[PDB]
Design an enzyme around this catalytic site. Structure first.
Site, PDB file in Angstrom:
ATOM      1  N   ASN A 149     -61.070 -26.133  57.839  1.00 27.47           N
ATOM      2  CA  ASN A 149     -61.741 -24.883  57.484  1.00 27.47           C
ATOM      3  C   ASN A 149     -60.734 -23.733  57.583  1.00 27.47           C
ATOM      4  OD1 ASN A 149     -63.321 -22.499  57.427  1.00 27.47           O
ATOM      5  ND2 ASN A 149     -65.138 -23.729  57.876  1.00 27.47           N
TER       6      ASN A 149
ATOM      7  N   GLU B 248     -54.441 -26.227  63.995  1.00 26.31           N
ATOM      8  CA  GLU B 248     -53.571 -25.466  63.123  1.00 26.31           C
ATOM      9  C   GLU B 248     -52.223 -25.167  63.768  1.00 26.31           C
ATOM     10  OE1 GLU B 248     -56.550 -24.435  64.205  1.00 26.31           O
ATOM     11  OE2 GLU B 248     -57.845 -23.974  62.425  1.00 26.31           O
TER      12      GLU B 248
ATOM     13  N   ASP C 175     -42.010 -26.170  37.395  1.00 27.97           N
ATOM     14  CA  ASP C 175     -42.898 -25.388  38.261  1.00 27.97           C
ATOM     15  C   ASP C 175     -42.873 -25.986  39.664  1.00 27.97           C
ATOM     16  OD1 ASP C 175     -44.708 -23.578  39.191  1.00 27.97           O
ATOM     17  OD2 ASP C 175     -46.490 -24.435  38.187  1.00 27.97           O
TER      18      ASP C 175
ATOM     19  N   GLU D 247     -54.827 -27.471  58.745  1.00 27.21           N
ATOM     20  CA  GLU D 247     -56.054 -26.779  58.390  1.00 27.21           C
ATOM     21  C   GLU D 247     -57.101 -27.745  57.853  1.00 27.21           C
ATOM     22  OE1 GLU D 247     -57.143 -23.930  58.902  1.00 27.21           O
ATOM     23  OE2 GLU D 247     -55.608 -22.347  58.664  1.00 27.21           O
TER      24      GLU D 247
ATOM     25  N   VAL E 251     -61.825 -20.620  59.938  1.00 32.00           N
ATOM     26  CA  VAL E 251     -62.165 -20.848  61.344  1.00 32.00           C
ATOM     27  C   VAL E 251     -60.989 -21.524  62.027  1.00 32.00           C
ATOM     28  CG1 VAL E 251     -63.762 -21.975  62.955  1.00 32.00           C
ATOM     29  CG2 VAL E 251     -64.593 -21.123  60.708  1.00 32.00           C
TER      30      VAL E 251
ATOM     31  N   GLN F 128     -58.152 -23.273  39.886  1.00 37.57           N
ATOM     32  CA  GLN F 128     -57.495 -22.114  40.500  1.00 37.57           C
ATOM     33  C   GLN F 128     -57.666 -22.137  42.011  1.00 37.57           C
ATOM     34  OE1 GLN F 128     -56.807 -21.716  36.631  1.00 37.57           O
ATOM     35  NE2 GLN F 128     -58.952 -21.778  37.300  1.00 37.57           N
ATOM     36  N   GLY F 129     -56.555 -21.908  42.716  1.00 41.68           N
ATOM     37  CA  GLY F 129     -56.492 -21.996  44.164  1.00 41.68           C
ATOM     38  C   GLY F 129     -55.995 -23.328  44.686  1.00 41.68           C
TER      39      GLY F 129
ATOM     40  N   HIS G  46     -44.842 -21.035  40.454  1.00 41.22           N
ATOM     41  CA  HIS G  46     -45.723 -19.936  40.083  1.00 41.22           C
ATOM     42  C   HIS G  46     -46.490 -19.372  41.279  1.00 41.22           C
ATOM     43  CE1 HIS G  46     -49.193 -22.804  39.457  1.00 41.22           C
ATOM     44  NE2 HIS G  46     -49.859 -21.737  39.868  1.00 41.22           N
TER      45      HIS G  46
ATOM     46  N   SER H  16     -53.355 -24.715  43.107  1.00 39.00           N
ATOM     47  CA  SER H  16     -51.972 -24.731  42.665  1.00 39.00           C
ATOM     48  C   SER H  16     -51.017 -24.856  43.820  1.00 39.00           C
ATOM     49  CB  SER H  16     -51.585 -23.471  41.914  1.00 39.00           C
ATOM     50  OG  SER H  16     -51.875 -23.709  40.553  1.00 39.00           O
ATOM     51  N   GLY H  17     -49.930 -25.564  43.550  1.00 31.39           N
ATOM     52  CA  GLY H  17     -48.929 -25.845  44.547  1.00 31.39           C
ATOM     53  C   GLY H  17     -49.237 -27.039  45.423  1.00 31.39           C
TER      54      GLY H  17
ATOM     55  N   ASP I 131     -61.498 -32.308  38.247  1.00 29.66           N
ATOM     56  CA  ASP I 131     -60.210 -31.677  37.957  1.00 29.66           C
ATOM     57  C   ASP I 131     -59.802 -30.814  39.148  1.00 29.66           C
ATOM     58  OD1 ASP I 131     -57.916 -30.930  36.456  1.00 29.66           O
ATOM     59  OD2 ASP I 131     -59.091 -29.839  34.942  1.00 29.66           O
ATOM     60  N   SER I 132     -58.531 -30.435  39.180  1.00 34.81           N
ATOM     61  CA  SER I 132     -58.098 -29.348  40.050  1.00 34.81           C
ATOM     62  C   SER I 132     -58.405 -28.014  39.371  1.00 34.81           C
ATOM     63  CB  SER I 132     -56.600 -29.467  40.370  1.00 34.81           C
ATOM     64  OG  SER I 132     -55.800 -29.479  39.179  1.00 34.81           O
TER      65      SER I 132
HETATM   66 CA   LIG Z   1     -58.763 -23.448  60.389  1.00 38.70          CA
END
Ligand SMILES: [Ca+2]
Length: 223
Positions: free
Chosen positions: A54, A62, A84, A52, A57, A174-175, A40, A177-178, A171-172
């Protein structure tokens, strides 16, 4: 993640952020050229962001690598969220190090009661909206299939499991996901869906990765 804690920079080295101009989903690095996420989460124009903490920043660990190919599971059902799961191939191999590392796939499924680590940059409020900059973590147990089906009548397939707390509060969201659900050092789940976040009797629902290992391995081998 609602009711979790700040992971600590690069303490979840397999966690990825998927970026299309902004963070929109999580994922998990499974080898130097492949990420697993939720079907999804599919969209065009994905940049995979590894190393990653932050997400707003540049902190110096990264790696930003564009996707060369996305493969949604052939049987992904957007109506029910069955299957999914999606694979993303990176245009170049990531450089693996202590802060950018793959997570092992399972060799067998996990059982109810096993404690797992769930992580992401999703909403931290069960009522309202607050999106964090640094990675958040939650320890949560796998719930029995019976409990999962009791919580979500008629909605749980053989490719889903619940994890969390029936009392709510953790809980987990929105955002997230995956992103990963890791239990005993294996990727057992992908953040998939739920009814609200951190609500009583509405635990998080996760894609059951152990059912997809043969598809993952064969797809990677052929692509
Ligand atoms: Ca960063």
């Amino acid at each position: 993640i609602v009711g979790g804690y700040t992971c600590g920079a690069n303490t979840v080295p397999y966690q990825v952020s998927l970026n299309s101009g902004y963070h929109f989903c999580g994922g998990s690095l499974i080898n130097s050229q492949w990420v697993v996420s939720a079907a999804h989460c599919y969209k065009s124009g994905i940049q995979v962001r590894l190393g990653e903490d932050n997400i707003n920043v540049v902190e110096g660990n990264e790696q930003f690598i564009s996707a060369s190919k996305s493969i949604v599971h052939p049987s992904y059902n957007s109506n029910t969220l069955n299957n999914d799961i999606m694979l993303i191939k990176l245009k170049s191999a990531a450089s693996l190090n202590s802060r950018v590392a793959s997570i092992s796939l399972p060799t067998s499924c996990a059982s109810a009661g096993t404690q797992c680590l769930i992580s992401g940059w999703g909403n931290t409020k069960s009522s309202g909206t607050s999106y964090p900059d640094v990675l958040k973590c939650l320890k949560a147990p796998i719930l029995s299939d019976s409990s999962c089906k009791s919580a979500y009548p008629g909605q749980i397939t053989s490719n889903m499991f619940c994890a969390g707390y029936l009392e709510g509060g953790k809980d987990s969201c929105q955002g997230d996901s995956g992103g990963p659900v890791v239990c005993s050092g294996k990727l057992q789940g992908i953040v998939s869906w739920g009814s609200g976040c951190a609500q009583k009797n509405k635990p998080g629902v996760y894609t059951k990765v152990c059912n997809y290992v043969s598809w993952i391995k064969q797809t990677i081998a052929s692509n």
